[PDB]
Design a protein around this ligand. Sequence first.
Ligand SMILES: C[S@@+](CC[C@H](N)C(=O)[O-])C[C@H]1O[C@@H](n2cnc3c(N)ncnc32)[C@H](O)[C@@H]1O
Length: 263
Amino acid sequence: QCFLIDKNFVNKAVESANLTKDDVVLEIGLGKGILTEELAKNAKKVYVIEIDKSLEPYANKLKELYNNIEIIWGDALKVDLNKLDFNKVVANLPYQISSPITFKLIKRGFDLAVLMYQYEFAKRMVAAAGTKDYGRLSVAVQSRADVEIVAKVPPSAFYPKPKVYSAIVKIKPNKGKYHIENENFFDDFLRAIFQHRNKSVRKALIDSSKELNYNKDEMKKILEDFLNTNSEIKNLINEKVFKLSVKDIVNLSNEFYRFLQNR
Ligand SMILES: C[S@@+](CC[C@H](N)C(=O)[O-])C[C@H]1O[C@@H](n2cnc3c(N)ncnc32)[C@H](O)[C@@H]1O
């Protein structure tokens, strides 16, 4: 595990979280408790989820100075977050769980999150349409949340010293911006098209038609018909997957759903 040892970046994350004594924070991973202490100072309460019992001495040391720290000993991927009552998430995330844990937190919901990722992963999270780093991850995150990189974090900020950079990412869920029609369908649609990101949306939808529960022939015929409901839809399915904006992919999947169910 790479522990955050540079207090300038702890200060930064804490600051980025815009904490008041009315916020309850969820922290993923205890570490040395350096981030934990700053959270307890500035928030009403902090839940820490830690899988390793060998770090208890830090927990018991902190519990002796602060009465507003509750430690949940377990695996952050397994804990039912619906049973906890918190509005914010601030953590130096264990880089192996970065993807599933993002989508679990976003699913559960929160006012704001401030999270440490590996730099390359953060780049994909914030990437603009039409770039090399734009992919399923970009769309899956942005369609649900406003994301930005707050700071680039050097290997020197951690101990032991990593091979690569990390990044502080600020996440602000915005459900009303894009309005997804059916979450399960939208997920299948993204998986399908980003399996062929440099093809047209329509050629992508055909090659991986399995994902939307069709064979290649039904889908080919489905797309010919869908095409004929308006010219906007014609221009979108003929464009390369990685060139559609999040707004276009959400808008396109919403209509392809309504087309399919009314069929
Ligand atoms: C990157 S360190 C960050 C800890 C601390 N915030 C720091 O930077 O000083 C990862 C921490 O999360 C814990 N951890 C790793 N995997 C976990 C998991 N699946 N669930 C809960 N905790 C985990 C590790 O024991 C370790 O304490």
